[PDB]
Amino acid sequence: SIVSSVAPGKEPGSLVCIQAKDGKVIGMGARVHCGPATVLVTAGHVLKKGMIADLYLAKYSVSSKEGKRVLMDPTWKIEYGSLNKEADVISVQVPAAVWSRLGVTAARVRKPTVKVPVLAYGGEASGLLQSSQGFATPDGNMSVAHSCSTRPGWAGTPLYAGSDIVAIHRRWNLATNLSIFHANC
């Protein structure tokens, strides 16, 4: 798996970091279309931390030439998924105002295909992102096997196939086949 630096602002427009209050990146996520609206999608064990501590959605701002972030409200409604279950995927009805302030566009969820090329993103700061290349294969249940290298703090990051998201990375590999749970939309 080839690992590469991603220049500030050149990551996909849907991607967001999830930070603790001291700025540490503890997970990733993305804005995706969900019926007539959009949702955050991330790992359930990442979102669970925001029940007892403050988490922030974070993304590099091209116009400000620095990172920006917005406090997460744990009472934002859950669209699908769960904080504690095996698939470890959850989606949240984040207000459009928050996505607007961070510059986050919505991506499309697509079904994975066999050995589809994929990119996964993560990093220690919103202008210090990196990507890892790999391939993804769905298992006929709710998961995808994939070959992207990841680091701790990449939990919840999408696997991108071209423009679209086909999976959610779980933990530092088996990702969740997002289209399975996205059918709740």
Author numbering: 5 to 176, 183 to 195
Passage from the reporting paper:
Sobemoviruses encode serine-like 3C proteases (Pro) that participate in the processing and maturation of other virus-encoded proteins. Its cis and trans activity is mediated by the naturally unfolded virus-genome-linked protein (VPg). Here, we solved a full Pro–VPg 3D structure of ryegrass mottle virus (RGMoV) that demonstrates the structural changes in three different conformations due to VPg interaction with Pro. The overall fold change of Δ117Pro is typical for CLP and is very similar to the structure of SeMV Pro.
First, in the absence of VPg, L87 shifted towards the VPg-binding pocket. Second, the α1 helix in the VPg-free structure is also slightly shifted towards the empty VPg binding site; although, the position of the catalytic triad H49, located on this helix, is minimally affected. These two conformational shifts are driven by the presence or absence of VPg, since they align well in the Δ117Procm and Δ117Pro cases, which do not contain VPg at all. However, in the Δ117Pro chain B, Δ117Procm, and Δ117Pro-E/A-VPg cases, D92 is directed towards H49, as would be expected in an active Pro. Surprisingly, conformational differences were observed between the Δ117Pro, Δ117Pro-E/A-VPg, and Δ117Procm states, with the only difference being the S159/A mutation. Different crystallization conditions could be at play, but it is very likely that these differences are actual representations of natural conformational oscillations in the Pro molecule.
